[PDB]
Write an enzyme that holds these catalytic residues in place. Structure first.
Site, PDB file in Angstrom:
ATOM      1  N   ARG A   1      -9.920   6.326   7.592  1.00  0.00           N
ATOM      2  CA  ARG A   1     -10.130   7.724   7.775  1.00  0.00           C
ATOM      3  C   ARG A   1     -11.040   8.042   9.037  1.00  0.00           C
ATOM      4  O   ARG A   1     -11.995   7.322   9.444  1.00  0.00           O
ATOM      5  CB  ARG A   1     -10.863   8.500   6.620  1.00  0.00           C
ATOM      6  CG  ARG A   1     -11.016   9.868   6.731  1.00  0.00           C
ATOM      7  CD  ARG A   1     -12.125  10.535   5.704  1.00  0.00           C
ATOM      8  NE  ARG A   1     -11.652  10.571   4.647  1.00  0.00           N
ATOM      9  CZ  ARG A   1     -10.586  11.730   4.244  1.00  0.00           C
ATOM     10  NH1 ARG A   1     -10.166  12.257   5.163  1.00  0.00           N
ATOM     11  NH2 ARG A   1      -9.724  11.710   3.200  1.00  0.00           N
TER      12      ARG A   1
ATOM     13  N   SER B   1      -7.048   0.023   1.829  1.00  0.00           N
ATOM     14  CA  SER B   1      -6.907  -0.820   0.651  1.00  0.00           C
ATOM     15  C   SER B   1      -5.350  -1.265   0.391  1.00  0.00           C
ATOM     16  O   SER B   1      -4.414  -0.433   1.011  1.00  0.00           O
ATOM     17  CB  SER B   1      -7.126  -0.339  -0.718  1.00  0.00           C
ATOM     18  OG  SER B   1      -6.391   1.249  -0.979  1.00  0.00           O
TER      19      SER B   1
ATOM     20  N   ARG C   1       0.789  -0.991   0.125  1.00  0.00           N
ATOM     21  CA  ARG C   1       0.053   0.064  -0.069  1.00  0.00           C
ATOM     22  C   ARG C   1       0.929   1.264  -0.007  1.00  0.00           C
ATOM     23  O   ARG C   1       1.555   1.348   0.875  1.00  0.00           O
ATOM     24  CB  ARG C   1      -0.925  -0.011   1.176  1.00  0.00           C
ATOM     25  CG  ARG C   1      -1.735   1.177   1.098  1.00  0.00           C
ATOM     26  CD  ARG C   1      -2.469   1.514   2.660  1.00  0.00           C
ATOM     27  NE  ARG C   1      -3.218   2.752   2.979  1.00  0.00           N
ATOM     28  CZ  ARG C   1      -4.019   3.361   2.133  1.00  0.00           C
ATOM     29  NH1 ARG C   1      -4.950   2.694   1.365  1.00  0.00           N
ATOM     30  NH2 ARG C   1      -4.406   4.596   2.396  1.00  0.00           N
ATOM     31  N   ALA C   2       0.370   2.226  -1.043  1.00  0.00           N
ATOM     32  CA  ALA C   2       1.239   3.514  -1.000  1.00  0.00           C
ATOM     33  C   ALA C   2       0.372   4.292  -0.053  1.00  0.00           C
ATOM     34  O   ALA C   2      -0.802   4.609   0.008  1.00  0.00           O
ATOM     35  CB  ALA C   2       1.240   4.003  -2.301  1.00  0.00           C
TER      36      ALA C   2
ATOM     37  N   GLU D   1      -8.090  -4.950  -5.688  1.00  0.00           N
ATOM     38  CA  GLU D   1      -8.001  -4.753  -4.407  1.00  0.00           C
ATOM     39  C   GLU D   1      -8.183  -5.407  -3.377  1.00  0.00           C
ATOM     40  O   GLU D   1      -9.063  -6.412  -3.573  1.00  0.00           O
ATOM     41  CB  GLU D   1      -9.073  -3.406  -4.040  1.00  0.00           C
ATOM     42  CG  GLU D   1      -8.724  -2.105  -4.995  1.00  0.00           C
ATOM     43  CD  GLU D   1     -10.071  -1.314  -5.245  1.00  0.00           C
ATOM     44  OE1 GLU D   1     -11.129  -1.858  -5.162  1.00  0.00           O
ATOM     45  OE2 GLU D   1      -9.815  -0.406  -5.671  1.00  0.00           O
TER      46      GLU D   1
ATOM     47  N   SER E   1       1.142   8.251   2.451  1.00  0.00           N
ATOM     48  CA  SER E   1       1.857   9.501   2.453  1.00  0.00           C
ATOM     49  C   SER E   1       2.266   9.504   4.291  1.00  0.00           C
ATOM     50  O   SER E   1       3.238  10.052   4.793  1.00  0.00           O
ATOM     51  CB  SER E   1       1.415  10.711   2.363  1.00  0.00           C
ATOM     52  OG  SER E   1       0.215  10.924   2.995  1.00  0.00           O
TER      53      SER E   1
ATOM     54  N   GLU F   1      -8.467  -2.884 -10.566  1.00  0.00           N
ATOM     55  CA  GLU F   1      -7.538  -2.255  -9.347  1.00  0.00           C
ATOM     56  C   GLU F   1      -7.175  -3.682  -8.632  1.00  0.00           C
ATOM     57  O   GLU F   1      -5.924  -3.616  -8.024  1.00  0.00           O
ATOM     58  CB  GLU F   1      -8.072  -1.341  -8.442  1.00  0.00           C
ATOM     59  CG  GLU F   1      -8.773  -0.171  -9.181  1.00  0.00           C
ATOM     60  CD  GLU F   1      -8.299   0.532 -10.175  1.00  0.00           C
ATOM     61  OE1 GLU F   1      -6.963   0.992  -9.920  1.00  0.00           O
ATOM     62  OE2 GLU F   1      -8.926   0.748 -11.107  1.00  0.00           O
TER      63      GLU F   1
END
Ligand SMILES: *O[C@@H]1[C@H](O)[C@@H](O)[C@H](O)O[C@]1(*)CO
Ligand SMILES: *O[C]1[C@@](*)([O])[C@@](*)(O*)[C]([C][O])[O@@](*)(*)C1(*)(*)O*
Ligand SMILES: *O[C]1[C]([C](*)[O])O(*)[C](O*)[C@](*)([O])[C@@]1(*)[O]
Ligand SMILES: *O[C]1[C]([O])[C]([O])[C@@](*)([O])[C]([C][O])O1*
Ligand SMILES: OC[C@H]1O[C@@H](O)[C@H](O)[C@@H](O)[C@H]1O
Ligand SMILES: OC[C@H]1O[C@@H](O)[C@H](O)[C@@H](O)[C@H]1O
Ligand code: NA
EC number: 2.4.2.-
Lengths: 103, 231, 103, 103, 103, 103
Positions: B25, B61, B7-8, B112, B10, B110
């Site tokens: 979130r 994800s 998973r990418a 996922e 930040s 995707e």
């Protein structure tokens, strides 16, 4: 009765506070005769011991020495942040008197 | 088995450690469920990605390969001068979105896999760094990871997920195979809002039960043994 | 007082350092009479014991022997990386005197 | 001195190795008078005890019995794969003498 | 020697099995004088004590009382499922004799 | 016998309940002579101690003091929610007599 480690450390001669706010980098433990002790380091190279029990210690401290090695081993293994140590600075390496953990 | 997902993100390793993992979130801490969180796979999967790789509606994800995660990362996070690709063990908090949502999967390309309640720190094998979209291919290991535990586990099978699909209450899926056999009360079945309330309560119950398993694996080793005879 | 495992190990006869930089592969523990001990192995095949308490040991080591077994058990279970072991090489398998964990 | 549980179990009469390669299915503990003991089972129904301390146990085994109960409790909780048990089979349930954990 | 908690519990007067198959809801511990004990509750409201040590206990139970308090504490923190409790029903709350954990 | 921490605390004159429903913010431990104690704080600044053992304590409480320091350490590291404390309030910081943990 002190409310925190700084005030506790101030009750004793030959002690000082190291403020670390970091996890322990290494934990060493020995059962060798006359060296039944622990040593910890931090990533800045600061090094500390829990001393071999000896004649400078009173009876009430012997259970507390054992507890302190328990505490340091688990802090090391769980990467827990060490806030401060209170240490005696008339030993090399400095000898732990108390630990505080927090973030 | 020892398969990994990717998973990418930040959010950097120190935020992850402080949060106890990679969070959906609106949740600051894994085990702390003192705050409200909607849990719904379908909503998660159809959510848009605006500078965050999908992490809404109670799931987080992952991609099935490093290449795929990196591609995803360039698309969403290219405005960041640094981001991370987290390498993640497979465990039964992970659902294959295409398998669970079937023909109704909104972005099947995707491929996922999504973690219900997010990914605990112990499940994170390590992380790579990405600079200006360029993958630095050094893998930084997480001391918190448990290899024997996680290499003995796999993602959840789709049949553990059908009942959590979270389709709208009157969607055709709830009357088709396979979902018909797992439909929450009120879903394709006199107080309003039953389907939504049961979808949410089944999610919360899943995460309660899963978190119990994580606590058991991790907190067990905080046990310090005492010399009982001396005491 | 030594500051690290290497210097501590150098204060004793019949001792040597092994450098593993790896987790423990297996942990074995016995309560059979006269074999109250623990045995660890590493994936490279190296095998080590914590010795049965015996007439070679002094009083101060008794608690330390028990602590070392506790430490190896939790190290095994949490897959902690063992850096170095200080062992006595006049026993087979070699007998643990000290352990250091880092990384 | 044995280097593994099979060789250790071979030193004693009336023992046998059981090879489980599985985690513990259940852990039971009792403080009832004359039944201060633990019992574990595996998913195939194999049942093992740590015996109540008694005349069959020398003084050096008392602390090892306590240690073994600790080991089984934490093995159960962490779902650690038990490789082999060394037991005495002149008891029912078979009585644990030693345990190995790997893989 | 019993093979399970149900059989163990039938060896004693004034006892019964409670089947919980649930984690502990709350854990309470006291060092207050004459009330050195633990209390646990389950979400269905069932409440159980580890009794204060007293003249109803034989010496062999003393260590086992301490172990049981250690077991309940870690079971509570890990959210481990408790299968069954064996208890004395001539005390209020019912007094723990034995615990089984599975599943 | 009490069935909860509130009813237990009501049995002593010099105790009160504090309701926290929060994890421990900091944990401090000392082995310094005459200050063998622990201190905990919560994020609102509430501070509590486990007292040094002394002449106010009966022999039965000595083992329970040691248990309570272990309890606070693992509660801190696991971030377990503390529900209530019963404390002696003729001491500063207030001195822990009992703890209850629940979500
Ligand atoms: O057993 C250790 C070592 O092998 C031996 O030479 C010495 O006499 O005692 C050591 C234990 O302290
Ligand atoms: O007074 C006193 C207080 O403070 C405390 O310490 C207690 C414990 O038990 O004791 C008395 O009461
Ligand atoms: O050993 C340290 C403390 C521990 O109580 O005792 C003092 O007497 C010493 O100066 C110090 O080194
Ligand atoms: O047998 C006696 C009592 O009747 C029981 O209620 C318990 O307190 C047991 C504990 O061994 O002792
Ligand atoms: O959402 C409104 C719809 O709800 C369904 O449960 C019902 O079968 C439909 O006839 C319609 O009433
Ligand atoms: O040391 C423990 C062992 O003691 C033996 O005498 C007995 O026959 C074994 O079953 C086992 O109890
Ligand atoms: Na896996």
């Amino acid at each position: 009765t002190p409310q925190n480690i700084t005030d506790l450390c101030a009750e004793y001669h030959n002690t000082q506070i190291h403020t670390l706010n970091d996890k322990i980098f290494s934990y060493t433990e020995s059962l060798a005769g006359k060296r039944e002790m622990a040593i910890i380091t931090f990533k800045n190279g600061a090094t500390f011991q829990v001393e071999v029990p000896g004649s400078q210690h009173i009876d009430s401290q012997k259970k507390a020495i054992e507890r302190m090695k328990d505490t340091l081993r688990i802090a090391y293994l769980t990467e827990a942040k060490v806030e401060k140590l209170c240490v005696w600075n008339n030993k090399t390496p400095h000898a732990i008197a108390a630990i505080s953990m927090a973030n | 088995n020892d398969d990994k997902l990717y998973r990418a993100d930040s959010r950097p390793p120190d935020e992850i450690k402080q949060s106890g993992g990679l969070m959906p979130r609106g949740q600051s801490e894994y085990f702390d469920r003192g705050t409200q969180m909607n849990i719904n796979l379908y909503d998660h999967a159809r959510g848009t990605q605006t500078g965050f790789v999908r992490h809404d509606d109670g799931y987080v994800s992952t991609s099935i390969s490093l290449r795929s995660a990196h591609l995803v990362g360039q698309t969403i996070l290219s405005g960041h001068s640094t981001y991370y690709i987290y390498v993640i063990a497979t465990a039964p908090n992970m659902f294959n979105v295409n398998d669970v949502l079937g023909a109704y999967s909104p972005h099947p390309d995707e491929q996922e896999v999504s973690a219900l309640g997010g990914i605990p720190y112990s499940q994170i094998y390590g992380w790579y760094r990405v600079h200006f979209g360029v993958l630095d291919e050094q893998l930084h290991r997480n001391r918190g990871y448990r290899d024997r535990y996680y290499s003995n586990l796999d993602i959840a099978p789709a049949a553990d997920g059908y009942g959590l699909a979270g389709f709208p209450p009157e969607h055709r899926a709830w009357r088709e195979e396979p979902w018909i056999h797992h439909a929450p009360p009120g879903c394709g079945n006199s107080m309003s809002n039953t389907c939504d309330e049961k979808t949410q309560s089944l999610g919360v119950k899943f995460l309660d039960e899963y978190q119990s398993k994580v606590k058991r694996q991790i907190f067990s080793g905080y046990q310090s043994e005492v010399d009982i005879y001396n005491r």
